[PDB]
Amino acid sequence: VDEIANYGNLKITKEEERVNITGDLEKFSSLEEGTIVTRFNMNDTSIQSLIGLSDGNKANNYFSLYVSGGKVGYELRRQEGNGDFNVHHSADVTFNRGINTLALKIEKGIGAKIFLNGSLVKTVSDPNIKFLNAINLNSGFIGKTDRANGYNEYLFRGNIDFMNIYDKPVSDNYLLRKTGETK
Ligand SMILES: CC(=O)N[C@H]1[C@H]([C@H](O)[C@H](O)CO)O[C@@](O)(C(=O)O)C[C@@H]1O
Ligand SMILES: [Ca+2]
Ligand SMILES: [Ca+2]
């Protein structure tokens, strides 16, 4: 494989560390499809954004790939007051106590798949699936979704071993094998 963006070896134990990838948005802003593969260790059980790409200074205008105590999912929201929507695809899963590996796969005209620890944990069949191209972005973060001020930013605590972003779907086979390294 070959990523358009590669982040790794990150420790996020408090609010301020906390990885600002805003300066990289031009790489992701036009993606209608793609894949995110990330290896991580969570410390809390609340909804935590592993990666949040968001507008503003807005409340509900964001992409969020999140993990929970018992869930994995993503949101793509808008906001703006014209063509507004709230997408939410998630799955009940059981994580390793320690290190976990997930992948979100988006394929334009097909839909979405979520992988975790070498299993396909969710299939979304949607020929009209949307991705980053569908919202305006002015903020990017690994470890939270940047939101207005009174809205929950899904603060992550723990470590991120790696975070690879691709501009193409990427085979199920590869994704099963990479995430499967933490089966
Ligand atoms: C992944 C998920 O379910 N997100 C939802 C969150 C969480 O349930 C709470 O923030 C948990 O405290 O709640 C909302 O009201 C919000 O904050 O915008 C709606 C949003 O879709
Ligand atoms: Ca853990
Ligand atoms: Ca903020």
PDB file of N, CA and C and ligand atoms in Angstrom, residues 46-47 59-60 62 64 66 71 73-75 77 86-88 90 147 150-154, ligand 1:
ATOM      1  N   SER A  46     -15.440   6.148  27.126  1.00  0.00           N
ATOM      2  CA  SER A  46     -16.328   7.087  26.450  1.00  0.00           C
ATOM      3  C   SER A  46     -16.061   7.132  24.944  1.00  0.00           C
ATOM      4  N   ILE A  47     -16.989   7.724  24.198  1.00  0.00           N
ATOM      5  CA  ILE A  47     -16.810   7.940  22.767  1.00  0.00           C
ATOM      6  C   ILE A  47     -15.619   8.876  22.531  1.00  0.00           C
ATOM      7  N   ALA A  59     -21.248  23.260  15.172  1.00  0.00           N
ATOM      8  CA  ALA A  59     -21.605  22.211  16.144  1.00  0.00           C
ATOM      9  C   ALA A  59     -21.658  20.815  15.528  1.00  0.00           C
ATOM     10  N   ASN A  60     -22.321  20.710  14.376  1.00  0.00           N
ATOM     11  CA  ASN A  60     -22.607  19.428  13.734  1.00  0.00           C
ATOM     12  C   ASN A  60     -22.084  19.363  12.304  1.00  0.00           C
ATOM     13  N   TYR A  62     -18.879  17.820  10.802  1.00  0.00           N
ATOM     14  CA  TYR A  62     -17.658  17.071  11.034  1.00  0.00           C
ATOM     15  C   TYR A  62     -17.659  15.640  10.526  1.00  0.00           C
ATOM     16  N   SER A  64     -15.936  12.126  11.969  1.00  0.00           N
ATOM     17  CA  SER A  64     -15.393  11.576  13.202  1.00  0.00           C
ATOM     18  C   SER A  64     -15.325  10.066  13.085  1.00  0.00           C
ATOM     19  N   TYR A  66     -14.599   7.193  15.415  1.00  0.00           N
ATOM     20  CA  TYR A  66     -14.546   7.045  16.864  1.00  0.00           C
ATOM     21  C   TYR A  66     -14.495   5.609  17.387  1.00  0.00           C
ATOM     22  N   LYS A  71     -18.063   0.055  21.243  1.00  0.00           N
ATOM     23  CA  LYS A  71     -18.460   0.412  19.887  1.00  0.00           C
ATOM     24  C   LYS A  71     -17.329   0.995  19.039  1.00  0.00           C
ATOM     25  N   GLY A  73     -17.322   3.250  15.239  1.00  0.00           N
ATOM     26  CA  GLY A  73     -18.158   3.867  14.230  1.00  0.00           C
ATOM     27  C   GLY A  73     -17.565   5.146  13.692  1.00  0.00           C
ATOM     28  N   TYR A  74     -18.239   5.717  12.701  1.00  0.00           N
ATOM     29  CA  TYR A  74     -17.889   7.033  12.182  1.00  0.00           C
ATOM     30  C   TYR A  74     -19.144   7.892  12.009  1.00  0.00           C
ATOM     31  N   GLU A  75     -18.950   9.204  12.052  1.00  0.00           N
ATOM     32  CA  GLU A  75     -20.001  10.145  11.715  1.00  0.00           C
ATOM     33  C   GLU A  75     -19.498  11.037  10.596  1.00  0.00           C
ATOM     34  N   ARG A  77     -21.245  14.610   9.351  1.00  0.00           N
ATOM     35  CA  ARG A  77     -22.358  15.534   9.632  1.00  0.00           C
ATOM     36  C   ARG A  77     -22.239  16.899   8.928  1.00  0.00           C
ATOM     37  N   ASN A  86     -27.085  13.856   8.842  1.00  0.00           N
ATOM     38  CA  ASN A  86     -26.317  13.214   9.901  1.00  0.00           C
ATOM     39  C   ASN A  86     -26.192  11.731   9.596  1.00  0.00           C
ATOM     40  N   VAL A  87     -25.027  11.353   9.087  1.00  0.00           N
ATOM     41  CA  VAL A  87     -24.691   9.959   8.849  1.00  0.00           C
ATOM     42  C   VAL A  87     -24.071   9.398  10.126  1.00  0.00           C
ATOM     43  N   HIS A  88     -24.423   8.158  10.459  1.00  0.00           N
ATOM     44  CA  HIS A  88     -23.865   7.465  11.615  1.00  0.00           C
ATOM     45  C   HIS A  88     -23.899   5.956  11.389  1.00  0.00           C
ATOM     46  N   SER A  90     -22.130   2.482  12.833  1.00  0.00           N
ATOM     47  CA  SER A  90     -21.369   1.948  13.956  1.00  0.00           C
ATOM     48  C   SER A  90     -21.711   0.488  14.210  1.00  0.00           C
ATOM     49  N   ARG A 147     -14.840  21.109  17.911  1.00  0.00           N
ATOM     50  CA  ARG A 147     -16.220  21.592  17.839  1.00  0.00           C
ATOM     51  C   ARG A 147     -16.417  22.941  18.530  1.00  0.00           C
ATOM     52  N   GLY A 150     -19.511  24.460  23.378  1.00  0.00           N
ATOM     53  CA  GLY A 150     -20.387  23.754  24.317  1.00  0.00           C
ATOM     54  C   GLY A 150     -20.734  22.345  23.867  1.00  0.00           C
ATOM     55  N   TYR A 151     -20.068  21.884  22.807  1.00  0.00           N
ATOM     56  CA  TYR A 151     -20.324  20.568  22.223  1.00  0.00           C
ATOM     57  C   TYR A 151     -19.191  19.571  22.486  1.00  0.00           C
ATOM     58  N   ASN A 152     -19.577  18.310  22.687  1.00  0.00           N
ATOM     59  CA  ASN A 152     -18.666  17.224  23.067  1.00  0.00           C
ATOM     60  C   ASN A 152     -17.667  16.908  21.959  1.00  0.00           C
ATOM     61  N   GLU A 153     -16.382  17.054  22.273  1.00  0.00           N
ATOM     62  CA  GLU A 153     -15.307  16.950  21.283  1.00  0.00           C
ATOM     63  C   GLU A 153     -14.669  15.557  21.228  1.00  0.00           C
ATOM     64  N   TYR A 154     -15.274  14.605  21.936  1.00  0.00           N
ATOM     65  CA  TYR A 154     -14.888  13.190  21.881  1.00  0.00           C
ATOM     66  C   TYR A 154     -13.409  13.005  22.174  1.00  0.00           C
TER      67      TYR A 154
HETATM   68  C1  LIG B   1     -21.174   9.019  18.124  1.00  0.00           C
HETATM   69  C2  LIG B   1     -22.455   9.599  18.717  1.00  0.00           C
HETATM   70  O1  LIG B   1     -23.351   8.858  19.125  1.00  0.00           O
HETATM   71  N1  LIG B   1     -22.503  10.933  18.731  1.00  0.00           N
HETATM   72  C3  LIG B   1     -23.644  11.698  19.265  1.00  0.00           C
HETATM   73  C4  LIG B   1     -23.228  12.388  20.579  1.00  0.00           C
HETATM   74  C5  LIG B   1     -22.883  11.463  21.740  1.00  0.00           C
HETATM   75  O2  LIG B   1     -23.946  10.527  21.918  1.00  0.00           O
HETATM   76  C6  LIG B   1     -22.696  12.268  23.025  1.00  0.00           C
HETATM   77  O3  LIG B   1     -21.834  13.388  22.779  1.00  0.00           O
HETATM   78  C7  LIG B   1     -22.099  11.402  24.127  1.00  0.00           C
HETATM   79  O4  LIG B   1     -22.000  12.165  25.322  1.00  0.00           O
HETATM   80  O5  LIG B   1     -24.306  13.232  21.072  1.00  0.00           O
HETATM   81  C8  LIG B   1     -24.745  14.290  20.197  1.00  0.00           C
HETATM   82  O6  LIG B   1     -25.865  14.912  20.854  1.00  0.00           O
HETATM   83  C9  LIG B   1     -23.628  15.350  20.018  1.00  0.00           C
HETATM   84  O7  LIG B   1     -22.804  15.495  20.957  1.00  0.00           O
HETATM   85  O8  LIG B   1     -23.627  15.998  18.951  1.00  0.00           O
HETATM   86  C10 LIG B   1     -25.182  13.673  18.834  1.00  0.00           C
HETATM   87  C11 LIG B   1     -24.062  12.766  18.259  1.00  0.00           C
HETATM   88  O9  LIG B   1     -24.460  12.152  17.037  1.00  0.00           O
END
